[PDB]
Scaffold this active site. Sequence first.
Site, PDB file in Angstrom:
ATOM      1  N   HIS A 162      -0.231  15.214   2.777  1.00  0.00           N
ATOM      2  CA  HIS A 162      -0.485  15.043   1.027  1.00  0.00           C
ATOM      3  C   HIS A 162      -0.681  13.715   0.472  1.00  0.00           C
ATOM      4  O   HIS A 162      -0.799  13.200  -1.146  1.00  0.00           O
ATOM      5  CB  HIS A 162       0.566  16.454   0.630  1.00  0.00           C
ATOM      6  CG  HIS A 162       0.652  16.972   0.938  1.00  0.00           C
ATOM      7  ND1 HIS A 162       0.375  18.715   1.550  1.00  0.00           N
ATOM      8  CD2 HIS A 162       1.535  18.023   2.239  1.00  0.00           C
ATOM      9  CE1 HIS A 162       0.452  19.180   1.614  1.00  0.00           C
ATOM     10  NE2 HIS A 162       1.428  19.516   2.210  1.00  0.00           N
ATOM     11  N   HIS A 186       6.817   6.999  -0.993  1.00  0.00           N
ATOM     12  CA  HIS A 186       5.017   7.374  -0.834  1.00  0.00           C
ATOM     13  C   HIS A 186       4.815   7.705  -2.419  1.00  0.00           C
ATOM     14  O   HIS A 186       5.787   6.432  -3.507  1.00  0.00           O
ATOM     15  CB  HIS A 186       4.898   8.355  -1.177  1.00  0.00           C
ATOM     16  CG  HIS A 186       5.596   9.162  -1.532  1.00  0.00           C
ATOM     17  ND1 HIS A 186       6.956  10.052  -1.826  1.00  0.00           N
ATOM     18  CD2 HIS A 186       5.781  10.376  -2.816  1.00  0.00           C
ATOM     19  CE1 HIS A 186       7.818  10.702  -2.907  1.00  0.00           C
ATOM     20  NE2 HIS A 186       6.359  11.429  -3.731  1.00  0.00           N
ATOM     21  N   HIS A 227       1.548   8.239  -5.020  1.00  0.00           N
ATOM     22  CA  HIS A 227       0.614   9.624  -6.031  1.00  0.00           C
ATOM     23  C   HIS A 227      -0.626   8.701  -6.194  1.00  0.00           C
ATOM     24  O   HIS A 227      -0.143   7.897  -7.521  1.00  0.00           O
ATOM     25  CB  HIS A 227       0.678  10.448  -6.877  1.00  0.00           C
ATOM     26  CG  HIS A 227       1.824  11.322  -6.395  1.00  0.00           C
ATOM     27  ND1 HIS A 227       1.712  12.293  -6.174  1.00  0.00           N
ATOM     28  CD2 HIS A 227       3.391  10.838  -6.308  1.00  0.00           C
ATOM     29  CE1 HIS A 227       2.876  13.452  -5.441  1.00  0.00           C
ATOM     30  NE2 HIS A 227       4.152  12.022  -5.072  1.00  0.00           N
ATOM     31  N   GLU A 247       1.546  10.340 -12.053  1.00  0.00           N
ATOM     32  CA  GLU A 247       2.544  12.021 -12.646  1.00  0.00           C
ATOM     33  C   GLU A 247       2.821  12.045 -14.040  1.00  0.00           C
ATOM     34  O   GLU A 247       2.410  13.113 -14.957  1.00  0.00           O
ATOM     35  CB  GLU A 247       3.289  12.478 -11.312  1.00  0.00           C
ATOM     36  CG  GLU A 247       2.288  12.377  -9.773  1.00  0.00           C
ATOM     37  CD  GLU A 247       3.028  13.492  -8.996  1.00  0.00           C
ATOM     38  OE1 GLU A 247       4.468  13.164  -8.291  1.00  0.00           O
ATOM     39  OE2 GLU A 247       2.384  14.834  -8.437  1.00  0.00           O
ATOM     40  N   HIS A 290       7.412   6.215  -6.203  1.00  0.00           N
ATOM     41  CA  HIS A 290       7.901   7.044  -6.385  1.00  0.00           C
ATOM     42  C   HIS A 290       8.876   6.854  -4.564  1.00  0.00           C
ATOM     43  O   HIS A 290       8.631   6.601  -3.102  1.00  0.00           O
ATOM     44  CB  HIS A 290       8.582   9.131  -5.920  1.00  0.00           C
ATOM     45  CG  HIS A 290       7.183   9.965  -6.989  1.00  0.00           C
ATOM     46  ND1 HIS A 290       6.491  10.475  -7.050  1.00  0.00           N
ATOM     47  CD2 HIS A 290       7.607   9.000  -8.028  1.00  0.00           C
ATOM     48  CE1 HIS A 290       6.348  10.113  -8.392  1.00  0.00           C
ATOM     49  NE2 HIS A 290       6.746  10.300  -8.934  1.00  0.00           N
ATOM     50  N   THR A 313       7.700  17.287  -7.419  1.00  0.00           N
ATOM     51  CA  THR A 313       7.113  17.232  -8.028  1.00  0.00           C
ATOM     52  C   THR A 313       5.691  18.078  -7.197  1.00  0.00           C
ATOM     53  O   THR A 313       4.493  17.893  -6.935  1.00  0.00           O
ATOM     54  CB  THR A 313       6.440  15.968  -8.294  1.00  0.00           C
ATOM     55  OG1 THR A 313       6.034  14.912  -7.431  1.00  0.00           O
ATOM     56  CG2 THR A 313       6.941  15.456  -9.318  1.00  0.00           C
TER      57      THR A 313
END
Length: 257
Positions: A61, A91, A93, A103, A116, A195
Amino acid sequence: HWGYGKHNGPEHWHKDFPIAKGERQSPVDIDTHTAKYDPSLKPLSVSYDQATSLRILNNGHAFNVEFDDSQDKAVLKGGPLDGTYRLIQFHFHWGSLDGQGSEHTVDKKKYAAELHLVHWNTKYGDFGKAVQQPDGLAVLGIFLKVGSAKPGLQKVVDVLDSIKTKGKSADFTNFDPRGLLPESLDYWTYPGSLTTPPLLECVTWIVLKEPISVSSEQVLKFRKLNFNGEGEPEELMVDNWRPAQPLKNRQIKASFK
Ligand SMILES: CCCCc1cnc(SCC(=O)c2ccc(S(N)(=O)=O)cc2)nc1
Ligand SMILES: [Zn+2]
């Protein structure tokens, strides 16, 4: 089964994880005008000098850079927090395009990516126990925009070809997360959730106002990763972000202005 596509993306998550439609879900749009300045908020305390990175992993992911969290070495405290929160992993996004990826949004603005830094409350003894508590996690969110390179990110970018596909990991020692921080620690804060599934409502969100800049080449590398495992059809790891969720009965506080 859950992921980021048409058939298993964020709009599908509530079927396996009904808390997706809960009262304190993340991310959210940060309406900078309705965020309340709170003079009782303390400066954020980031103590990362003793951080011990161990490994970087493609979990299908995103990629996680994991830290040794078995002693008080890299800790977040102060800000809105009571007590001490230990860094376990970070990590990102990110988007398929520079125009999306983050996000959290700021007055509906989407950044190219979002970092994050995930921390767990030492009073709960470990990560797995902490996520079952409403004050179990503190996640420090940092926006990325595309422009000048972030030198302190390059070590991360350079190892990604070695963890291209789901399940791959690599030794990743002596990485210093202080090289990912912008100059100012001004922040917004609000009670929210993980999230990604299991979407647990255990997070105090601390989102920095100042984005970091990363180069187009740095973010391009992120986009070369794969959601799929080795020897499977290539699905590029892009758009691994959850969209803004209803604020509902919550107030976003600002540490500034
Ligand atoms: C429901 C019972 C299972 C308890 C349990 C839940 N989640 C996890 S892990 C998910 C995770 O590590 C994570 C960390 C940060 C973020 S974010 N993207 O909010 O920073 C999302 C997921 N591990 C154990
Ligand atoms: Zn995240």
